[PDB]
Amino acid sequence: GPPTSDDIFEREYKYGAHNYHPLPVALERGKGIYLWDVEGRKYFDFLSSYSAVNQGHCHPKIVNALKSQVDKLTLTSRAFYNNVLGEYEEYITKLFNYHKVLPMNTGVEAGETACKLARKWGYTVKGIQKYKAKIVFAAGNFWGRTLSAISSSTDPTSYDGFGPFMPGFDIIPYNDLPALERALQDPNVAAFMVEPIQGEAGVVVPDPGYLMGVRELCTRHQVLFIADEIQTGLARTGRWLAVDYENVRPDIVLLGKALSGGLYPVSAVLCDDDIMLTIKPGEHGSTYGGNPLGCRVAIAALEVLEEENLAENADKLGIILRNELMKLPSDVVTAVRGKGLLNAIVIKETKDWDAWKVCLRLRDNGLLAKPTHGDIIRFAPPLVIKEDELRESIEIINKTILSF
Amino acid sequence: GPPTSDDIFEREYKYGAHNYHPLPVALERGKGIYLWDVEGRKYFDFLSSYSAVNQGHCHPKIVNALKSQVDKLTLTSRAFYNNVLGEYEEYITKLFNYHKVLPMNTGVEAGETACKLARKWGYTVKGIQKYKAKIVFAAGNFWGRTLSAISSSTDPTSYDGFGPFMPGFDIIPYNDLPALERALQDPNVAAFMVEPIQGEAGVVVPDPGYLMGVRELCTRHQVLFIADEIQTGLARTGRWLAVDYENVRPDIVLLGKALSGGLYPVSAVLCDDDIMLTIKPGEHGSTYGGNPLGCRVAIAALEVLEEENLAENADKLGIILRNELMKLPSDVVTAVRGKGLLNAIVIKETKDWDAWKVCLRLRDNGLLAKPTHGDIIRFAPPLVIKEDELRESIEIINKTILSF
Numbered sequence: 001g002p003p004t005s006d007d008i009f010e011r012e013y014k015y016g017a018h019n020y021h022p023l024p025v026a027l028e029r030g031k032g033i034y035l036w037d038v039e040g041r042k043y044f045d046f047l048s049s050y051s052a053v054n055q056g057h058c059h060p061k062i063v064n065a066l067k068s069q070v071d072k073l074t075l076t077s078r079a080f081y082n083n084v085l086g087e088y089e090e091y092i093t094k095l096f097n098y099h100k101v102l103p104m105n106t107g108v109e110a111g112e113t114a115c116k117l118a119r120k121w122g123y124t125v126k127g128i129q130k131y132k133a134k135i136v137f138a139a140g141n142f143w144g145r146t147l148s149a150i151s152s153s154t155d156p157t158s159y160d161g162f163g164p165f166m167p168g169f170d171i172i173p174y175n176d177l178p179a180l181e182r183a184l185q186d187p188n189v190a191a192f193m194v195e196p197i198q199g200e201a202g203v204v205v206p207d208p209g210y211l212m213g214v215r216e217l218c219t220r221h222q223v224l225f226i227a228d229e230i231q232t233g234l235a236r237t238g239r240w241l242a243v244d245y246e247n248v249r250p251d252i253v254l255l256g257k258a259l260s261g262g263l264y265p266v267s268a269v270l271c272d273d274d275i276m277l278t279i280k281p282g283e284h285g286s287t288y289g290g291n292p293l294g295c296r297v298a299i300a301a302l303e304v305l306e307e308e309n310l311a312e313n314a315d316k317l318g319i320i321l322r323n324e325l326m327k328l329p330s331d332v333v334t335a336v337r338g339k340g341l342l343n344a345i346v347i348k349e350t351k352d353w354d355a356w357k358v359c360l361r362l363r364d365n366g367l368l369a370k371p372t373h374g375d376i377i378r379f380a381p382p383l384v385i386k387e388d389e390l391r392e393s394i395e396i397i398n399k400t401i402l403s404f
Numbered sequence: 405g406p407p408t409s410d411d412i413f414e415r416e417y418k419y420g421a422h423n424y425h426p427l428p429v430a431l432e433r434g435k436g437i438y439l440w441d442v443e444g445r446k447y448f449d450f451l452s453s454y455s456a457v458n459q460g461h462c463h464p465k466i467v468n469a470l471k472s473q474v475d476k477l478t479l480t481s482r483a484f485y486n487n488v489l490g491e492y493e494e495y496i497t498k499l500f501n502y503h504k505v506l507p508m509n510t511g512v513e514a515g516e517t518a519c520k521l522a523r524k525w526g527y528t529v530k531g532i533q534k535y536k537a538k539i540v541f542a543a544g545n546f547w548g549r550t551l552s553a554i555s556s557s558t559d560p561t562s563y564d565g566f567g568p569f570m571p572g573f574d575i576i577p578y579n580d581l582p583a584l585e586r587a588l589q590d591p592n593v594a595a596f597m598v599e600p601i602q603g604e605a606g607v608v609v610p611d612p613g614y615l616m617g618v619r620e621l622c623t624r625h626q627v628l629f630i631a632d633e634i635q636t637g638l639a640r641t642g643r644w645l646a647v648d649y650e651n652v653r654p655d656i657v658l659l660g661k662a663l664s665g666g667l668y669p670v671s672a673v674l675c676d677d678d679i680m681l682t683i684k685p686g687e688h689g690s691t692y693g694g695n696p697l698g699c700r701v702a703i704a705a706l707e708v709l710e711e712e713n714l715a716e717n718a719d720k721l722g723i724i725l726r727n728e729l730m731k732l733p734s735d736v737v738t739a740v741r742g743k744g745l746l747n748a749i750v751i752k753e754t755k756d757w758d759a760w761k762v763c764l765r766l767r768d769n770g771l772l773a774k775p776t777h778g779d780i781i782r783f784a785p786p787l788v789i790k791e792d793e794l795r796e797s798i799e800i801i802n803k804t805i806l807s808f
């Protein structure tokens with residue numbers, strides 16, 4: 001017979017690294033908003049692989065894009081040209097109104113690329129002496145697990161024990177314009193990198209006007225505004241970019257995770273020529289960056305986001321979701337926050353009770369979510385969810401919370 | 405009409421970053437050893453996307469693995485389990501005889517993972533004080549384009565202008581056991597990372613006994629031996645790992661690039677428990693790392709390497725290839741080097757003449773290669789090439805070199 005859930009757990013424990021402690025559920029199929037485990041049980045996906053499957057699992061248009069391109073060509077390396085890359089580049093740059101895109105594979109690779117662009121621009125355009133350029137980050141940031149990315153983290157689990165750290169990364173509080181204004185007095189600062197809503201930190205939504213203020217301060221002090229929209233972009237918050245809510249144009253925009261609908265690791269760095277062209281041929285790249293297969297998949301995923309109006313659905317259904325979540329009692333759920341379909345609730349963590357046990361019971365009742373701190377539970381279903389499906393899942397959430 | 409080659413070049417120039425200057429050829433299909441451009445012209449691929457398509461372009465078994473898995477499930481994130489990952493992990497760990505694998509996406513991500521493992525092991529097992537751990541690298545190394553990876557590079561084009569650098573990375577000459585012995589006198593050294601043959605540096609093959617000496621010195625001084633086999637592994641040099649030529653077992657083995665046959669970005673970090681389990685749950689990861697689609701593709705690519713005996717083919721045909729290349733005159737080709745099907749020739753670069761013009765003419769004559777320094781031309785066709793195909797390509801190379 002084929003392996004049970006427990007066989008799957010045990011096998012991973014024996015042969016795989018222990019860098020994760022996942023929710024004990026062994027999934028097998030995903031379609032749209034749904035996931036099935038090896039026993040056949042059906043669940044709503046309320047994690048969406050951290051927004052990588054905004055389009056729902058195995059969206060048939062993106063699946064067909066993958067299938068059509070793999071029968072053909074998948075990787076030439078950028079030592080030669082392929083056809084697909086230029087088409088995808090024109091598409092995405094015109095969609096987001098930037099001169100150019102630099103293609104990479106994973107989100108952290110886009111972050112690293114942004115850091116390199118900011119430093120190169122700082123030395124060659126702003127005139128900072130090599131190698132005094134600084135980049136400012138917001139406490140609570142998460143942008144990956146490289147040595148550089150954990151060097152900007154304030155989370156000890158990300159950086160503790162991981163050797164000496166990248167210099168030139170400063171940290172200020174999130175949602176704090178006076179602190180940014182103070183940091184940007186140093187002319188050696190080249191950039192400020194920030195998430196428009198902090199995902200991994202617990203869906204931390206900054207105050208209205210924060211993004212506008214960030215843009216104003218960055219412009220005033222000749223500092224690049226890098227917006228990490230790898231989790232908040234591509235309709236998840238109800239707009240193409242979360243920064244669109246304040247009509248703010250960052251200098252560099254990072255995209256990832258739903259850029260492919262979960263079918264391929266595709267990431268993008270968007271900016272104008274006076275920043276992008278600071279990097280000359282041979283000075284940056286990636287083996288799989290810009291390969292034809294991922295490019296086809298990304299064109300298809302962006303087209304799915306546009307043609308199915310998923311940002312508007314995210315907006316309206318997130319309004320419904322937060323309104324319903326706020327009816328849970330204050331004695332158990334101390335906070336409800338989010339934008340569009342990126343939301344979270346905060347648990348009145350006792351020790352009779354916590355976010356992990358809540359997610360276990362939610363799995364028991366047919367809905368999959370995972371906590372991000374122990375009192376924070378993220379709710380982020382695929383943007384293809386319909387209102388009746390959302391209301392049934394909300395019913396599951398109510399049943400689970402009021403089970404305790 | 406559909407875009408010509410020149411349209412493709414111009415479009416990428418307008419909408420894409422200028423981080424590459426590729427060989428002017430616009431490819432469209434790849435199958436096995438062959439590539440076709442948009443005009444219909446046919447070429448031998450003698451770059452193999454830097455060994456990512458060891459199995460040849462669009463190998464039907466790996467294509468079918470991709471197609472079968474994408475109709476199903478592609479990404480749950482590691483917040484939950486999927487079935488495929490444990491199966492792939494058991495497979496690859498038993499294949500290479502290590503306790504465990506840590507899955508990532510790109511080669512540089514495997515390198516970063518290795519660095520984190522080495523530091524965490526240095527502090528928690530070797531007892532180095534935080535954060536004094538050092539990692540030693542070999543001059544000429546290339547392992548990616550993150551800030552940490554360019555911090556260990558001796559190539560100014562990789563690091564110049566890219567902000568202050570990661571501390572704790574020391575550099576010694578390649579192919580130099582006395583220099584390694586000298587570096588390892590510092591008890592704060594946690595690891596030595598090295599390529600068994602330096603690919604990007606120009607297929608630099610170290611002297612016989614170098615890998616044995618590295619292993620002996622690392623063991624003697626309680627230092628981890630990290631072997632980057634992302635380009636040299638998976639049959640390319642004629643063995644499963646290039647280190648197999650000296651029956652050397654590194655502490656950490658990095659795999660990438662052919663791990664997927666070019667169909668998906670899949671990388672792996674292999675090592676035993678006493679190293680791997682220094683990283684605890686929540687302390688490292690990746691969104692796409694270990695996803696089911698890439699895992700299916702990787703199982704298939706490894707199976708193709710094993711069942712088609714591609715390491716033996718690489719061995720014998722590389723013998724033939726180097727023997728034939730050495731018949732070109734000394735006045736034009738000053739050196740021929742390599743192992744298995746990873747080879748290179750060195751050009752007597754005049755200014756009447758150089759490696760770029762040679763590769764242009766080779767493209768004109770139906771074979772695609774790219775220089776790596778201006779007198780170095782890499783020859784690395786897919787390991788599915790047959791002897792008559794190889795001899796025809798050698799004929800192309802002769803025709804081209806003796807055209808000048």
Ligand SMILES: *[C@H](NC1=C[C@@H](C(=O)O)C[C@@H]1F)c1c(COP(=O)(O)O)cnc(C)c1O
Binds near residue numbers: 107111195689
């Ligand atoms: C990716 N998001 C994160 C990775 C996940 C995990 O595996 O635990 C959960 C988490 F929120 C991310 C990145 C990095 O992208 P990748 O390297 O993982 O592809 C960068 N910035 C942001 C905002 C996010 O969400």
Ligand SMILES: *[C@H](NC1=C[C@@H](C(=O)O)C[C@@H]1F)c1c(COP(=O)(O)O)cnc(C)c1O
Binds near residue numbers: 510546547633
């Ligand atoms: C990958 N090899 C390199 C990338 C290529 C390019 O785009 O120019 C050519 C070059 F040789 C590599 C890596 C990094 O893997 P990725 O991040 O690119 O996936 C690490 N180590 C080695 C030995 C190699 O070859």
